[PDB]
Amino acid sequence: SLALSLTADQMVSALLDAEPPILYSEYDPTRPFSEASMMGLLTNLADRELVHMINWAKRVPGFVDLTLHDQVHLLECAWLEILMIGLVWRSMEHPGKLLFAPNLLLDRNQGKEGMVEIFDMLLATSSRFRMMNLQGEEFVCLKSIILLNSGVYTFSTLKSLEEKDHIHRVLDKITDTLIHLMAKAGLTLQQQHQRLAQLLLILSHIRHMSNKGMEHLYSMKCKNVVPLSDLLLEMLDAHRL
Amino acid sequence: KNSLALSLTADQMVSALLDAEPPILYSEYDPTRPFSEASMMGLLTNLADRELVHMINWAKRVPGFVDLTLHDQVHLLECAWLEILMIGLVWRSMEHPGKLLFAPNLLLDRNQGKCVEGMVEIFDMLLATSSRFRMMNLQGEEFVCLKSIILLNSGVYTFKDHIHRVLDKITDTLIHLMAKAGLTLQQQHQRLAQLLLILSHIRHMSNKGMEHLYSMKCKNVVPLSDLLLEMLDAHR
Amino acid sequence: HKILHRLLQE
Amino acid sequence: KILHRLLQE
Numbered sequence: 259s260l261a262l263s264l265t266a267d268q269m270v271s272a273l274l275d276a277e278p279p280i281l282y283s284e285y286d287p288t289r290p291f292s293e294a295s296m297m298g299l300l301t302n303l304a305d306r307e308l309v310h311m312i313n314w315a316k317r318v319p320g321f322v323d324l325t326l327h328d329q330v331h332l333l334e335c336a337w338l339e340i341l342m343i344g345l346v347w348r349s350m351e352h353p354g355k356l357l358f359a360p361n362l363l364l365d366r367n368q369g370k371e372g373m374v375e376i377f378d379m380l381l382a383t384s385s386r387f388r389m390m391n392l393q394g395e396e397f398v399c400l401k402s403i404i405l406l407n408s409g410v411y412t413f414s415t416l417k418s419l420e421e422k423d424h425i426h427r428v429l430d431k432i433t434d435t436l437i438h439l440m441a442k443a444g445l446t447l448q449q450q451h452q453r454l455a456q457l458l459l460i461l462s463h464i465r466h467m468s469n470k471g472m473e474h475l476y477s478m479k480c481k482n483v484v485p486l487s488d489l490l491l492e493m494l495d496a497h498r499l
Numbered sequence: 500k501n502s503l504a505l506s507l508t509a510d511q512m513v514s515a516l517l518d519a520e521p522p523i524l525y526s527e528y529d530p531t532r533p534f535s536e537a538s539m540m541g542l543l544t545n546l547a548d549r550e551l552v553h554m555i556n557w558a559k560r561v562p563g564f565v566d567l568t569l570h571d572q573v574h575l576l577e578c579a580w581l582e583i584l585m586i587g588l589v590w591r592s593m594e595h596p597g598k599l600l601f602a603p604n605l606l607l608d609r610n611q612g613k614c615v616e617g618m619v620e621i622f623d624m625l626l627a628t629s630s631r632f633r634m635m636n637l638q639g640e641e642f643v644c645l646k647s648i649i650l651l652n653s654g655v656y657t658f659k660d661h662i663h664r665v666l667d668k669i670t671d672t673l674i675h676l677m678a679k680a681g682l683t684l685q686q687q688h689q690r691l692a693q694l695l696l697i698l699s700h701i702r703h704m705s706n707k708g709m710e711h712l713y714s715m716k717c718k719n720v721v722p723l724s725d726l727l728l729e730m731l732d733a734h735r
Numbered sequence: 736h737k738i739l740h741r742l743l744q745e
Numbered sequence: 746k747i748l749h750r751l752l753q754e
């Protein structure tokens with residue numbers, strides 16, 4: 259395993275190099291939008307982002323050491339959390355707004371169905387990132403933590419437990435990396451531990467948002483007005499709501 | 500304005516939280532191992548309802564909680580109640596691999612979850628969390644810290660400074676316990692991360708459980724207390 | 736009117 | 746399984 263042999267600096271570099279691109283939406287400020295078409299735009303964007311996410315996951319240290327089945331599972335569990343934290347990160351410097359794309363910056367007024375509650379949570383998370391002055395180096399660590407951690411407890415044999423053991427080792431490495439970054443930023447030991455806790459507690463809120471979003475997405479499918487892409491439908495069904 | 504909670508020492512914090520611990524309650528004494536969805540969910544709902552009353556009195560004893568306005572206290576508990584019930588269950592179950600100790604006289608396994616539609620998935624998640632805690636050798640002092648973190652953290656972003664200062668205090672307290680337990684520096688931050696990451700899974704279980712409870716509500720088979728109904732309704 | 740309100744005060 | 750396939754290529 260090359261993953262467990264990386265230094266904190268190499269881990270940061272590896273994660274930064276693997277960052278996906280910021281995609282554009284089909285939004286047109288001159289075109290009228292319904293709640294349905296607005297959600298059509300976001301669905302379209304998410305679908306495209308998912309493809310880049312899959313190829314990003316392959317570049318997260320340790321991830322390809324896992325079996326195809328385990329990779330599939332982790333992504334099925336973490337996909338919406340990962341999209342959401344990315345959205346929150348992009349929006350950090352736009353108080354009151356969510357930057358879905360460089361050409362699509364929304365406020366809560368453009369939430370109008372049930373998406374409005376979710377927008378509010380996302381906005382609060384961005385506000386929280388801003389309060390903390392979240393750094394890019396810390397963001398990439400957090401994103402990789404989500405990928406590896408979210409599905410780790412919902413996976414057979416004593417052998418199949420070794421797979422889980424490897425993940426925990428990589429997770430520990432990312433913790434080390436976070437601490438390393440804070441130490442470099444001049445934080446005291448007490449401050450390092452406090453900030454690490456603060457960052458990890460955010461992941462609980464991201465899980466919550468993902469769960470709420472997953473339910474709204476399911477209701478959308480059933481209403482059958484906003485067409486979901488095939489990949490999105492399969493990811494959604496993986497959660498069996 | 501200033502909260503007494505912030506002036507406590509690590510040891511004072513630990514003792515206060517240990518002293519605030521609610522009691523382990525019993526289920527009905529009938530020896531008929533529940534196999535129906537009705538008797539199953541009836542016993543669990545009855546137990547949950549009684550546990551909730553103790554939880555509300557426990558929360559008032561968590562340092563910093565009573566400093567919040569009543570409305571803030573209500574918000575935190577409405578958001579955290581099921582997470583708190585679940586981590587408690589998991590903790591009680593830790594020394595009973597493969598079993599969920601809902602009460603000393605109600606020890607269930609996954610097969611019994613099979614009788615309630617949608618419950619086996621939740622049981623399996625709970626059992627996995629229990630195993631994880633056992634393999635980590637979770638201590639009671641760490642447990643009470645984690646439970647208080649849930650109370651303060653889960654609803655904090657749906658509203659702050661006071662709450663975050665208290666959360667920082669509890670973090671200090673966890674590290675204090677780990678240093679007292681002889682862990683090295685690297686072991687301290689690694690363990691802190693491992694424990695806090697489990698809170699993500701606990702949140703996940705609560706969300707799934709809340710959905711299950713809502714369906715149980717619309718099925719209208721098992722009566723729910725007004726209290727449990729109001730706690731559930733808070734999650735829209 | 737919530738019961739929780741009453742319990743938190745009791 | 747779309748996700749399964751994309752993970753392969």
Ligand SMILES: Oc1ccc(C(c2ccc(O)cc2)C(Cl)(Cl)Cl)cc1
Pocket residue numbers: 297300301302303304307341342344345358373376471475486490
């Ligand atoms: O970069 C993102 C794009 C879409 C989403 C979501 C999303 C995901 C899938 C969809 O079909 C629609 C919206 C919400 Cl619900 Cl937050 Cl807008 C999240 C992050």
Ligand SMILES: Oc1ccc(C(c2ccc(O)cc2)C(Cl)(Cl)Cl)cc1
Pocket residue numbers: 540543544545546547550584585587588601621708711712727
């Ligand atoms: O100590 C506990 C008691 C009941 C529960 C739950 C519970 C909560 C409320 C109910 O009405 C029924 C079960 C589940 Cl969902 Cl795990 Cl069975 C959880 C922990």
